[PDB]
């Protein structure tokens, strides 16, 4: 109705871009893990299962490469649009720093213009989300069929081997939680520099399929020290379980190691897609607010009404600059987290 009711703020955009970065950065590291993982050779012995494992491994590696190189760039592109918008709000602020007597009209047209820009960023986000949802609809059936392959083999295992399979599944779920604790401590809700590494954590004899796993960098300064000690303990026990299950069915151990790497990639893809689902609607809310504000900013034309508009605009400009720094940080993480360095 009047100046006090307009919302020129970034609304939930800052928190949403942090929650997106949270999962997308981790999924960047899981992509590098799938790409670093030694390929299974045609050891044969059981060529049927080997083809099925290699097929899934190759299809996952191809999807990890598409996320690492294409999807990340597409997200960095969305974040750049948020930076751009922040600059435009800061331009509206720069306008009000002049003693133009017709500032109310020039200001209202600029806000009405940003309204249209927000509507475009809405469409830009919707495009990325459609791409993410399309792949998600392909990755779930792919993983589901591979899980049917594993389960079909497991129903025919002896008592001891079926238990080594349960133990592997349990530790893979435990190690996931450990990695999540470690990454969240490094991320500090968008203020930190998320950095994870990798190493050979286990091996299955055939001559030797060597399984890669995520590790913390700086086993001394990474927030959640509890999680690092659990991770080392869990990897040690995981290595035993694989060597054990391998005496019964070696390629089953390989298959479970591949599925564990996939579970992390597909689960974090799905979370990245669900955090992204809300972004179009939010840009839409910014577009709707800016459109409504325009006529109100125009009516504020008295010396005092202008001073009050300048005040509101300057406050929302500072809010957008704080979000613009949150974006620069996220963009620097995506850049620096492109490499998954080795650890000993």
Residue numbers in the entry: 2 to 207, 229 to 366
From the paper:
Tripartite α-PFTs are members of the ClyA α-PFT family. Proteins in this family undergo a large scale conformational change from a compact soluble structure, where the hydrophobic residues are hidden often within a β-tongue motif, to an extended pore structure with the hydrophobic residues exposed in two extended α-helices which insert into the cell membrane. Here we show that S. marcescens has a tripartite haemolytic α-PFT (SmhABC), and propose a mechanism of pore assembly. We present the structures of the soluble A component (SmhA), as well as the soluble and pore conformations of the B component (SmhB).
